[PDB]
Design a protein around this ligand. Structure first.
Ligand SMILES: Cc1cc(C)c(C)c(S(=O)(=O)Nc2ccc(N3CC[C@H](C(=O)O)C3)c3ccccc23)c1C
Length: 290
């Protein structure tokens, strides 16, 4: 359910199919069952000890193709299993989980930028569209806090976004929440305690290192200790009350750089480095493969 940091897919010269797990308890990396198709700018989530890869795109030399797929990886069997496909392909996707259901936010398909949202029901192996986001959003940040889905930043088609909105599943509607202090396309969005962190990204001109959090109670975005490196198209996850950023693009290189955020000590620290440097990775935390 939650023990190893899994890094699914990514990109470096082409869309990677790598599935490496990191043990923060001994700094080790474990290469596992490669993804059936390589994918990049996909989402990674965990539902009931099972790891899911949602969306992305296969930027290959033989031709680039956005994904509608939702694969499943099992730490016990160390196997990938193709599950029910989402109505649409969604590259630079956003995913969150509310009450054991995967929500698939925005993402792009060819020139189209999606405003749409779809909900996977693992018990039935079905995908059903729900009300769409108020804005079209790619490279969107998605986080669930208090059984509410939040879509942070992204790119509408014309503008890079600082805006964010919340989804209330019962009413099946989206309302805008306080906008960020910074414009963030290709952010790294997660939830730690009661705050929603939006780290790095691209403000239209440069890769960001700034990390700002949204406090739900107070409804205000606030800056915190910046990251060591500037990153857009980065991996983010929370493990044992510490935010972990994974790779991404700095403006010059596709980083191998993995940083941990101690919110208690308000500090970012170089924790390891992924085998290969890469961007657009899918990242989730679940049980070891034993
Ligand atoms: C540098 C770069 C160039 C190429 C050719 C590709 C293919 C990749 S990628 O695989 O990682 N995909 C992604 C490219 C660009 C992204 N955002 C970030 C900022 C950028 C913008 O508004 O300018 C759009 C992404 C966001 C989330 C996930 C994957 C993203 C990368 C990062």
């Amino acid at each position: 359910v939650g023990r190893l940091i899994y890094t699914a897919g990514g990109y470096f010269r082409q869309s990677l199919s790598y599935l490496e797990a990191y043990n923060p308890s001994n700094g080790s990396w474990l290469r596992l069952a490669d993804l059936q198709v390589p994918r990049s700018g996909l989402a990674g989530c965990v539902v009931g000890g099972l790891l899911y890869a949602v969306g992305g795109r296969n930027n290959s030399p033989d031709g680039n193709t956005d994904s509608s797929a939702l694969d499943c990886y099992n730490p016990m069997t160390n196997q990938w299993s193709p599950c029910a496909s989402m109505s649409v392909p969604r590259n630079r996707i956003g995913v969150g989980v509310i009450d054991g259901h995967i929500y698939a936010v925005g993402g792009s398909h060819g020139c189209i930028h999606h405003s749409s949202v779809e909900r996977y029901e693992p018990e039935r192996d079905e995908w059903h569209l729900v009300a769409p986001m108020l804005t079209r959003r790619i490279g969107v940040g998605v986080a669930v806090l208090n059984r509410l889905l939040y879509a942070v930043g992204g790119f509408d088609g014309t503008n890079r976004l600082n805006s964010a909105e919340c989804y209330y599943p019962e009413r099946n509607e989206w309302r805008m929440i306080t906008p960020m202090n910074t414009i963030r396309s290709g952010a790294g969005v997660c939830v730690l305690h009661n705050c929603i962190y939006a780290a790095g990204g691209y403000d239209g001109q440069d890769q960001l290192n700034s990390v700002e959090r949204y406090d739900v109670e107070t409804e205000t975005w606030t800056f915190v200790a910046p990251m060591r490196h500037h990153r857009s198209a980065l991996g983010i996850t929370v493990h044992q009350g510490k935010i972990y950023v994974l790779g991404g693009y700095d403006g010059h290189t596709f980083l191998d750089s993995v940083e941990c955020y101690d919110p208690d000590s308000d500090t970012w620290s170089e924790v390891t480095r992924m085998t290969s440097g890469r961007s657009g990775v899918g990242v989730a935390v679940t049980m070891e493969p034993c």
